[PDB]
Amino acid sequence: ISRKWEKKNKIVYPPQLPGEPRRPAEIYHCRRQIKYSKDKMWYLAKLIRGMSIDQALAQLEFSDKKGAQIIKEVLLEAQDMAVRDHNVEFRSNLYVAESTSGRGQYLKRIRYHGRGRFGIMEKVFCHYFVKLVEGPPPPREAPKTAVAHAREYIQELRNRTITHAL
Amino acid sequence: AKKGFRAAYRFQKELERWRLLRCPPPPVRRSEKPNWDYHAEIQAFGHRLQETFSLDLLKTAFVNSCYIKSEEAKRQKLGIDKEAALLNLKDNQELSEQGISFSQTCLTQFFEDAFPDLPTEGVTSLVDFLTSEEVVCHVARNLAVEQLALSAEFPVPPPVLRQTFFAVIGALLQSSGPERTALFIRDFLITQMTGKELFEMWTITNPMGLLVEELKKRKISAPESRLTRQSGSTTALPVYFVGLYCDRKLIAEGPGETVLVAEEEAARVALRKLFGFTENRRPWDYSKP
Amino acid sequence: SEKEFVEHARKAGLVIPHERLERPIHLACTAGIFDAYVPPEGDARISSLSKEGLAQRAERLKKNVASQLSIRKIRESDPNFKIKDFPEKAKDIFIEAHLCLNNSDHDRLHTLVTENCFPDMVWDIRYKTVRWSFVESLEPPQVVQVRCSSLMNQGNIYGQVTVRMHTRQTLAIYDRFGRLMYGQEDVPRDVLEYVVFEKHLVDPYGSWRMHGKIIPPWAPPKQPILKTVMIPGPQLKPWEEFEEPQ
Amino acid sequence: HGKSVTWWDEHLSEENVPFVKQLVSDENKAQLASKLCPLKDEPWPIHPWEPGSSRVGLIALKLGMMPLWTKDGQKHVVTLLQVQDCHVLKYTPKENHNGRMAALTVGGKTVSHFHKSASILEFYQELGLPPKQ
Amino acid sequence: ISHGRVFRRLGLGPESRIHLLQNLLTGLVRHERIEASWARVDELRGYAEKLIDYGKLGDTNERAMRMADFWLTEKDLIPKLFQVLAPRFQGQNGGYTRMLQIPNRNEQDRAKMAVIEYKGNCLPPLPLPRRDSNLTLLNQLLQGLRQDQEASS
Amino acid sequence: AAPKNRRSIEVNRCRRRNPQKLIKVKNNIDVCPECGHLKQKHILCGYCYEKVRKETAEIRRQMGKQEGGPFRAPTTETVVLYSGETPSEQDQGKRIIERERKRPSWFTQN
Amino acid sequence: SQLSPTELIEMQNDLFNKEKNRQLSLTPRTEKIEVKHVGKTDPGTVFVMNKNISTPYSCAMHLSEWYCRKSILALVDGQPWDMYKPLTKSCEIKFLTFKDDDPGEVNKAYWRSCAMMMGCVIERAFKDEYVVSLVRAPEVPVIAGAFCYDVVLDKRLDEWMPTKENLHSFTKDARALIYKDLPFETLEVEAKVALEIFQHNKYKLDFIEEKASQNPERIVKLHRFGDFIDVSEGPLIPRTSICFQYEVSAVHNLQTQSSLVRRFQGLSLPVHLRAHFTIWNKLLERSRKMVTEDK
Amino acid sequence: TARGTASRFLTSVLHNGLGRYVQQLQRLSFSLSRDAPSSRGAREFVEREVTDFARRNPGVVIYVNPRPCCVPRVVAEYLNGAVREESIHCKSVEEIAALVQKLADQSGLDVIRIRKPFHTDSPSIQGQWHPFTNKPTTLGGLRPREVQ
Ligand SMILES: [Mg+2]
Ligand SMILES: [Mg+2]
Ligand SMILES: [Mg+2]
Ligand SMILES: [Mg+2]
Ligand SMILES: [Zn+2]
């Protein structure tokens, strides 16, 4: 096994020279060897990306997936870690930087079939990773306006060259 | 397990490579690296440029204020006695001033002689450009001046490098005549003007006005913008060719997306013909008189 | 098809193997401070007066029976011992220990400070950055009292010396992201600390160490934090109604 | 911004709901009975009948079916179609639509205001009818 | 094709459905408030409304009695229907029942849940949804319109 | 019928990261004016409904103590009371449940 | 005094910044005040805050984003506080919402804010050649079908009343104002340095004089958003973004003996309360009628 | 392969050979073993050739390090900043000489595919074709069906 994500919270930065912009907090946290599947977990973890932490808690609160409550618990833990251990005012000020599902170590079992054949079955486990960053949520990108597409096209026609030409 | 040193060692090399790929090390002076002899370096500089310097004057030329103040930090923090031998160092300030003054004079003369029709504002703009931060730093760093320069903060911020380059010029001006140094300048500076435009380095914002003034000076009257060629007006990509006429003769002409853009172009073209900064123009002379 | 996981870690305190220890735990120090000197309540207004403070301090030192009984036990067990030299050494121990917290060097910090002190001064601060400087000592370090604990089991004696000291210090604590947390680096702030020292006597290697730090009940409220802090009300289950005291 | 979903009813008190309903229904009565007199308003010029001509249609409502008899004795079955509120809504000229025949847009029975869209409600607002299904 | 089918299929068949609603009804008449599968509660609500109208028909009506006999399973309840429930609904024609959606069941089957109730029961009141007050900004803007529908009449 | 070739990871990402298989964001969530927890707008508040549920259970327990057996249910209406209360003239002639707790804030006297 | 339109803006903003930095300098340290929470929701909660720095908005942030978005006004003790107005002493706090049971306080605030917005929209919507004097924002009850702002205009402009085009332009500009989200900022000032801000508007100086007259310490209440500053009675809503539906309904010329004053009426609703298209049209129709309460 | 690797246009460093020619190779560092056989050629080269090489090229500084290594290398280093590594391991004197020459005459630019064999600033003297260059102009400059 490999446990890295945990140690990401043990990093110490050099103090900030005055006049430099204030560095936003980062909190890495995870839960290992959950009895959920990795994929079913992925949908959930995907849902809450880039949401402000309260928004994610609200969304998870009402989902019916078994994983919803796991993730929620991990988020509360991470929030309290962020205010207690790292120094963060305004526990509402976190947004979800990274949310993802890794695969755990699987158990292996028999699945009985008929005519004495068998399949080989896997009791599945998974990991849930999260990384919380201090600040408002970064703005969701608007699709390209007609103006943007037109500029790009024009710029392209203008990048043309006489080819194999000299 | 597999028994051998070889693959293990060879892999140690891969490990080091990845280590350097994920965290690049901050750039280090060539002087603090394994093979260095400052003296031999200096001599080689001179020989490779095909010039002859006084080694005292060059060694002087690569010295800077900052190197001396940092050396005084190391002097004062350890309680050492330096002052006589350290303040004997004779920095490059003087040399750099002679260098820049002479180079600006030289250049100005070169252009003034080559482009008789360039307005003084123009030739000024040109000398300004070839003496710029960008150009001089590029050339200096490619001649291994950054290598030899004595300075704090290894990337050697651009003002220090301009200082040091022209320091070397001045050192050359003492070491050899203004003739020799004029040749060096026309070889390592003027060549950066290759491929470049006029209005690439001049930056003037109203071509039409400037054209009208220059034509007052030439005793020609009223450039009239007259539309020559066009394709599609209703398109999202039109092309206009605007001509400029003086007494119904055509002086110059240009393309554009919009009739305004194109008119402005025809102005720039006309300007470029008048001033004799042109594509067809005689390429520069590199020769030994 | 049959394999299971292993490694569910647990901590089980159980008195039986704890008793069966064949080499009983050897302590360099004792966790408590036997007798805590409780200082004058006007000790702020007698500090600006030199020969008031000095007089009453030296007086209370010479006048006390317990004080000179313990000083006699230390002098008789440990020759070439002097009380008039000691606040110098103590003040030096201080300055080195805290300059150890700056650099975060724990090895030297285990020679200087005691086993009871180390958890305290190191623990919370290990993921942060500390910058601590010594600028002035306003009133030269005073020796308030001396005490001895006689363990009849070991025949072991621990000399405990309380040095009251008044100081000028600059403390800045930075957060693990390098952003300032506690206090400025430019303010030479004035402190008053009652610093307990300890030494093992029967021990041949006989280190003088910094045992503990006593804060008086009237001590000036420490400078305020930078960040805002919230204190939640009692967490309520559904059927439990809230009750407000006045 | 996470702006929440909302319907017409949501923020009204128990007091104001009957009020709003009255408001809407009453203005529906007014509006329908106002356009009740077509010929005295500004009728578009009436033309006589040309041979290849074609009339406007209707939007009706299927009621049910009924038997009906003919004088020869035979039985028929018929469908009742009730016309409820039927108005011509807009007019697209001949050259703007098929290049052959003009287009009249006819509305069907009245529906609630609250469950249509801003666009459509604007279209009827400038007309002065209530929304058609 | 399901067109105009009023009753939903539950249980092991039509009969099993009736017996399901039997138990639910009995439960409702005894405890006066129960919670079940939103669909089953919805299905029940009709019968729970009509039972009260058979109770209104009186003890002496035979039809109402063998009706309440079949539907109320624990026979002890049959008096309570006639002598408690049916009397306390007199004025109101249809208003007997309140049915609300509860949050989804906390068990892993995560069902859709409803609470169903006989009005005027003696229990802590459900946290019903309240309409907005009249003091609310938008409603205050409507009150203006109202008072000008009075002033212009 | 057996798959003729392994499906590539690109294809499979296309299938399962499709918008239609993604969890869709619920926009009807709000706060309960009472306890300040979360609820969907068309559904009762879970928390408040839990208070009510507990109290209901207690009342039913104590009205199970008044009934000596399974089949005895009163032929009269009932009323529930709390510490420091007495049956009104309108409320007398009814089954009385007496509870120890003080009458809850949400629960009115009626 | 010879001054451009932009110079007035510059002077006023620089004065405001001077004053704000003076109030900042008045507080030497980071002082800790203990706020308590009297709200129906999370009782016993205690915030430990920075005196004259921390605001009731910065207070909500310790709870959850939910307060942050839902809370328009902050009741401190018995008084309404603007969400960004820094807390002075230790106290108790309750938060106030649009869908709350006795919203009246909030309603008032909302109305005021909208009025002020319109004011801005008006002052900058006229040609430099003319002279636009904002008068005041008369405080109407909200049962009155609109909110309004009093404005006097250049004498040569006295003959025209606007066209639906112009009104719709005002509206477009107000919506332009909403789109970019500007916090409403508050400052408490002494009349001496208050009058120096406004100057050229006479009516403003009169208003300031009365407003300061009824208060013992000569305190005037200033609000500002973006580059626009105005004096007003009572607190305002925290953000510009709070408004969703907004209209400048119609104007009405009303004349004293000594002045000719135009009254601009407009109507708006917050995102929280937003009303259906039909409902909106009816309210909009009532908002066209003259609304008179000055007393 | 060409789609596989990077590429560059044909260039000179600092317009070399325009004004004057500057030998681009700056310094040369040898590392060899006095003892080990692998370095044999490299030793002979250092004996006979290096000296003469150093006279033939005044502008390059040559650092020779005897050290205990198994694999003799030569590190060429250029004005360009470019550093090119080579192994003289187990070669003749002749081979090494040829190699050191290649190093001497290289530009220090990266060796990759070169997109085209020529490089011109201002290829275009006397014009550059555009759709109108060969078209005749008409009277009034009217379009095809335009009337006046
Ligand atoms: Mg078998
Ligand atoms: Mg398989
Ligand atoms: Mg498998
Ligand atoms: Mg079934
Ligand atoms: Zn609730």
Short mmCIF file of C-alpha atoms in Angstrom, two decimals, chain B residues 50-230:
data_model
loop_
_atom_site.label_atom_id
_atom_site.label_comp_id
_atom_site.label_asym_id
_atom_site.label_seq_id
_atom_site.Cartn_x
_atom_site.Cartn_y
_atom_site.Cartn_z
CA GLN B 50 39.22 38.43 -32.31
CA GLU B 51 40.03 41.47 -30.18
CA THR B 52 42.94 42.51 -27.99
CA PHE B 53 42.19 43.76 -24.48
CA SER B 54 44.28 44.89 -21.56
CA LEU B 55 43.54 42.13 -19.04
CA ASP B 56 43.48 44.75 -16.29
CA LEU B 57 40.82 46.77 -18.11
CA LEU B 58 38.61 43.77 -18.93
CA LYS B 59 38.89 42.26 -15.44
CA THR B 60 37.82 45.72 -14.34
CA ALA B 61 34.95 45.77 -16.84
CA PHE B 62 33.31 42.65 -15.41
CA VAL B 63 33.22 44.07 -11.86
CA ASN B 64 30.02 45.58 -10.46
CA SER B 65 28.84 47.71 -7.54
CA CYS B 66 26.64 44.95 -6.12
CA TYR B 67 29.44 42.39 -6.09
CA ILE B 68 31.51 44.82 -4.02
CA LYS B 69 28.73 45.63 -1.53
CA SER B 70 27.97 41.92 -1.04
CA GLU B 71 31.70 41.35 -0.59
CA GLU B 72 31.58 44.07 2.08
CA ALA B 73 28.67 42.25 3.73
CA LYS B 74 30.85 39.13 3.92
CA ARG B 75 33.76 41.37 5.01
CA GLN B 76 31.88 43.09 7.85
CA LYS B 77 29.94 40.05 9.12
CA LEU B 78 33.03 37.88 9.72
CA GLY B 79 35.23 40.65 11.17
CA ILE B 80 37.79 40.41 8.34
CA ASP B 81 40.22 43.05 7.06
CA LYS B 82 39.57 43.56 3.33
CA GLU B 83 39.18 47.31 2.82
CA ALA B 84 42.54 48.17 1.18
CA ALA B 85 42.57 45.23 -1.31
CA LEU B 86 38.75 45.21 -1.76
CA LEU B 87 38.26 48.98 -2.31
CA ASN B 88 41.25 48.73 -4.65
CA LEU B 89 38.85 46.90 -7.01
CA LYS B 90 38.06 49.89 -9.26
CA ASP B 91 34.51 49.15 -10.45
CA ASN B 92 33.15 49.39 -13.97
CA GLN B 93 31.05 52.55 -13.65
CA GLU B 94 33.49 54.77 -15.57
CA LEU B 95 34.07 52.24 -18.35
CA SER B 96 30.34 51.68 -18.75
CA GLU B 97 29.69 55.41 -19.12
CA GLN B 98 32.33 55.85 -21.83
CA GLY B 99 30.95 52.71 -23.43
CA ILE B 100 27.32 53.79 -23.65
CA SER B 101 28.17 57.33 -24.74
CA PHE B 102 30.51 56.13 -27.50
CA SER B 103 28.12 53.39 -28.64
CA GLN B 104 25.23 55.82 -28.96
CA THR B 105 27.45 58.26 -30.87
CA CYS B 106 28.82 55.50 -33.14
CA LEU B 107 25.41 53.96 -33.86
CA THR B 108 23.86 57.37 -34.46
CA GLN B 109 26.57 58.13 -36.99
CA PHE B 110 26.11 54.74 -38.72
CA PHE B 111 22.39 55.22 -39.22
CA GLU B 112 22.63 58.91 -40.05
CA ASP B 113 25.08 57.96 -42.81
CA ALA B 114 23.05 55.00 -44.10
CA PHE B 115 19.57 56.57 -43.96
CA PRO B 116 19.93 60.26 -44.88
CA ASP B 117 16.14 60.67 -44.89
CA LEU B 118 15.49 59.33 -41.37
CA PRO B 119 14.14 62.12 -39.13
CA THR B 120 16.15 62.71 -35.93
CA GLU B 121 13.29 61.32 -33.87
CA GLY B 122 13.62 58.13 -35.90
CA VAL B 123 17.38 57.60 -35.61
CA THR B 124 16.95 58.32 -31.90
CA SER B 125 14.29 55.61 -31.72
CA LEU B 126 16.62 53.17 -33.49
CA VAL B 127 19.65 53.78 -31.28
CA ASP B 128 17.26 53.50 -28.34
CA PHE B 129 16.19 50.10 -29.62
CA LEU B 130 19.62 48.60 -30.28
CA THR B 131 20.80 49.88 -26.88
CA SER B 132 17.67 48.43 -25.22
CA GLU B 133 17.48 46.19 -22.20
CA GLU B 134 16.19 43.30 -24.28
CA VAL B 135 18.63 43.32 -27.18
CA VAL B 136 21.80 44.04 -25.23
CA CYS B 137 20.97 41.42 -22.59
CA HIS B 138 20.30 38.83 -25.31
CA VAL B 139 23.58 39.53 -27.09
CA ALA B 140 25.60 39.81 -23.85
CA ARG B 141 24.32 36.53 -22.46
CA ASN B 142 25.06 34.86 -25.82
CA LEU B 143 28.66 36.12 -25.77
CA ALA B 144 29.26 34.64 -22.29
CA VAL B 145 29.30 38.02 -20.59
CA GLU B 146 26.82 36.77 -17.97
CA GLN B 147 29.28 33.95 -17.43
CA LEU B 148 32.18 36.26 -16.56
CA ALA B 149 30.31 39.09 -14.79
CA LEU B 150 30.82 39.48 -11.05
CA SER B 151 27.48 40.18 -9.43
CA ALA B 152 25.10 39.25 -6.63
CA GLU B 153 21.92 37.31 -7.58
CA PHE B 154 23.08 34.91 -10.35
CA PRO B 155 20.39 35.47 -12.95
CA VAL B 156 22.12 38.94 -13.07
CA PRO B 157 19.16 41.31 -13.51
CA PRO B 158 19.08 43.09 -16.91
CA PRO B 159 20.33 46.58 -15.86
CA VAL B 160 23.53 45.03 -14.45
CA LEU B 161 24.01 43.16 -17.72
CA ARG B 162 23.59 46.26 -19.90
CA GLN B 163 26.10 47.92 -17.60
CA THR B 164 28.50 45.03 -18.05
CA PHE B 165 28.17 44.75 -21.82
CA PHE B 166 28.91 48.39 -22.41
CA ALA B 167 31.62 48.12 -19.81
CA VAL B 168 33.26 45.64 -22.15
CA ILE B 169 32.70 48.07 -25.05
CA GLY B 170 34.50 50.84 -23.17
CA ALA B 171 37.32 48.50 -22.21
CA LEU B 172 37.67 47.83 -25.93
CA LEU B 173 37.67 51.59 -26.63
CA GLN B 174 40.64 52.07 -24.31
CA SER B 175 42.39 48.88 -25.49
CA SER B 176 41.98 49.71 -29.19
CA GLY B 177 40.96 52.63 -31.38
CA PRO B 178 37.45 53.95 -32.09
CA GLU B 179 37.76 52.20 -35.44
CA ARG B 180 38.09 48.70 -33.95
CA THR B 181 35.25 49.34 -31.51
CA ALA B 182 33.07 50.72 -34.31
CA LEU B 183 33.57 47.40 -36.12
CA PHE B 184 32.66 45.41 -32.99
CA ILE B 185 29.49 47.50 -32.58
CA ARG B 186 28.41 47.10 -36.19
CA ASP B 187 28.99 43.33 -35.89
CA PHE B 188 27.29 42.48 -32.57
CA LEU B 189 24.62 45.18 -32.33
CA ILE B 190 23.62 46.35 -35.80
CA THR B 191 23.06 42.71 -36.81
CA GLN B 192 20.15 42.50 -34.34
CA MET B 193 18.45 44.89 -36.74
CA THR B 194 18.32 42.09 -39.34
CA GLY B 195 14.83 41.13 -40.48
CA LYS B 196 13.26 43.82 -38.35
CA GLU B 197 10.95 46.55 -39.63
CA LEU B 198 11.06 50.31 -39.13
CA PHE B 199 7.76 50.72 -37.38
CA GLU B 200 8.52 47.56 -35.49
CA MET B 201 11.01 49.55 -33.41
CA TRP B 202 9.76 53.14 -33.95
CA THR B 203 6.23 52.72 -32.45
CA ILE B 204 4.74 56.01 -33.82
CA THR B 205 0.92 56.02 -33.46
CA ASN B 206 -0.39 58.35 -36.22
CA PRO B 207 1.24 57.54 -39.59
CA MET B 208 -0.99 59.87 -41.58
CA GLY B 209 -0.05 63.04 -39.68
CA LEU B 210 3.66 62.24 -39.79
CA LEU B 211 3.37 61.64 -43.52
CA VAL B 212 1.70 65.02 -44.09
CA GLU B 213 4.45 66.82 -42.17
CA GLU B 214 7.21 65.02 -44.09
CA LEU B 215 5.50 65.94 -47.35
CA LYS B 216 5.30 69.62 -46.25
CA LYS B 217 9.06 69.38 -45.78
CA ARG B 218 9.44 67.87 -49.29
CA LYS B 219 7.15 70.60 -50.72
CA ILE B 220 4.53 68.03 -51.84
CA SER B 221 0.97 68.86 -50.90
CA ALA B 222 -1.96 66.59 -50.14
CA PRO B 223 -1.91 62.81 -49.99
CA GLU B 224 -5.41 61.67 -51.03
CA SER B 225 -6.64 58.28 -49.93
CA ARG B 226 -8.17 56.52 -52.92
CA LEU B 227 -9.58 52.98 -52.81
CA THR B 228 -7.81 50.73 -55.29
CA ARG B 229 -8.71 47.04 -54.87
CA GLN B 230 -11.37 45.37 -52.74
#
